[PDB]
Amino acid sequence: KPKLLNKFDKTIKAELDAAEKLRKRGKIEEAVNAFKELVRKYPQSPRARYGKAQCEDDLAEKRRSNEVLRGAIETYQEVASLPDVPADLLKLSLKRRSDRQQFLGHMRGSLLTLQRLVQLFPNDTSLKNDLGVGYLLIGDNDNAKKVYEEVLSVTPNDGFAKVHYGFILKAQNKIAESIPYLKEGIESGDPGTDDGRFYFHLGDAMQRVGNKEAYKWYELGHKRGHFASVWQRSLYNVNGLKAQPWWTPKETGYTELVKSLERNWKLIRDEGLAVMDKAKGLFLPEDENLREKGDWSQFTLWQQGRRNENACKGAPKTCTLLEKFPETTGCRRGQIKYSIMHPGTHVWPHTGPTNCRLRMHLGLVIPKEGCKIRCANETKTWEEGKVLIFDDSFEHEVWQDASSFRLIFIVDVWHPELTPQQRRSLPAI
Amino acid sequence: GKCKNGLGEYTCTSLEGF
Ligand SMILES: O=C(O)CCC(=O)C(=O)O
Ligand SMILES: [Fe+3]
Structure with missing residues (x-):
């Protein structure tokens, strides 16, 4: 690779690298301080600002602190507000912002961040797929459906979009319509499709229409680790609990x-x-x-x-x-x-x-x-x-x-x- | 919505950070 350095940042790479080395070695408090100093001396540096945010992110993990993470989420946004931010850095910063907002349960905040990403990168289909997930997480299936219809209008064979569109159709009781989307999406093997939720609902949709293939999909879902067994298909499990009907x-x-x-x-x-x-x-x-x-x-x-x-x-x-x-x-x-x-x-x-x-x-x-x-x-x-x-x-x-x-x-x-x-x-x- | 009796929602648990 990503191109994260603007013209000025290339001129301060030695200082930027020194700070990042502290972060990679686990000296988070030292790295935070190093990047805080860089942000002071070079307030417009996008790489320095991203480094500060990454260190706050790691520090939040170290201290298990939501408030520290809230700071990182703000700094990730600050990167995007700086002048001359490289495109790869802008996407990485806002993507991580949205992801951490979701971790904290700030679902409307993630949605606004994902909306901004799609506006800034209109040809990135992955970002629209991520926006759809944002709508799904807040329970807005109507808007999520429209997002995946947009994706499938340009990339009809995007398997991530297919399984998620299929999931929405099934939730709306459009059982027959949901089956080809869930099935083709899983069969695509695209990242994000090997998910127990889609095996669960493909097999269930098949059972509801009398398609006897349902249990071949339950068998595969079990073989791939999504189900404890073909009969026991819960997805929020503690492994090893006695299993008996x-x-x-x-x-x-x-x-x-x-x-x-x-x-x-x-x-x-x-x-x-x-x-x-x-x-x-x-x-x-x-x-x-x-x-x-x-x-x-x-x-x-x-x-x-x-x-x-x-x-x-x-x-x-x-x-x-x-x-x-x-x-x-x-x-x-x-x-x-x-x-x-x-x-x-x-x-x-x-x-x-x-x-x-x-x-x-x-x-x-x-x-x-x-x-x-x-x-x-x-x-x-x-x-x-x-x-x-x-x-x-x-x-x-x-x-x-x-x-x-x-x-x-x-x-x-x-x-x-x-x-x-x-x-x-x-x-x- | 809540996953009271099935797996109908995209996610069944709430997100509260750490
Ligand atoms: O028989 C009932 O009222 C509910 C059956 C059921 O699906 C359940 O108890 O989980
Ligand atoms: Fe039941």
Whole structure:
């Protein structure tokens, strides 16, 4: 290689090299000071400014400090404001700025930086691809879709753009349309396409249209390290946790919780029925595109280890009962919720995002016929007042063909083999 | 949106730096 030195910078290369050598040798504090001195003496030097930013970046890593990193992010921008900045340096500085803004969770800031990059380098397709990711990270699928449509208009066979366009189409329930983009994108082998998210959604789109090739893609995704197995396809995992579709209470160790749910199941049922009868708007329809058809709604008391205070006003005894069990109330990768499903419902085969939880189901109102749940290769039914336990990281599927409603209580627990240290440090999902 | 029950979002965790 990159050309990072402007005319003046070539005249001070000896000083610039001396400072960078300190950085490369790990003398970060000395390197910071060396580049700070260069920025003082040569305030317009783009290479000196970039060196200062790189040292602040390394220092932020050394001190694990977001504030130090915020300084680097500003200095990376200062490089771009200086006169006569070489094109290669301008791109490197603003790209790293955007990347570090994303690390900090400053997604709107990264977006503005990525927008500037595309304006400065209009023919760089990689930068537009990066802008699309910026929109995806903030949840703006509509603008991300338009970015990848622009990329595919000029480079139709860009595989990064194909898989991401396919991902967006799938999210919008354009299943058939998404398959060729996801498939051709993965097959391109372009950098960024060998990603478990695209294998996950290609196979799922294929399953939804009845394409039996789905599991060849799950097999390949497993062989390439994205899935623990063809059946267990979660992407936010702690490696090595016991992997089994169905669990007994004793196997989980959470026997006191299970005893409490089964001994007190009728109070849990009754509060759920009262909400159905007098506060039915607390049941929210499932909103993750997991239904082929039918009506399925959830009343959530806990999510991400956080109690919903207003919801617990609707099930106060159930919330009081459950507060004695932090193995569920503190499961920041699970929920506690009522789940109602009505006749004519089919839930698509799907997997949850993480192997770090197990999912308990307490039967509350179970019709005598028509309701069942498959996990992996094994299908079961619910019983009123009894707990079933499965690992939702394994593919599972549900049918409701009874002649009345089916109500269960879903209680997520931390995987029993996760230590307290792990349970405290895993990011919430 | 949150990845409550599937993997429908591009990312399922929040970004908070160090
Ligand atoms: O049967 C239900 O209400 C939900 C089934 C399910 O997909 C799950 O519990 O993860
Ligand atoms: Fe599920």
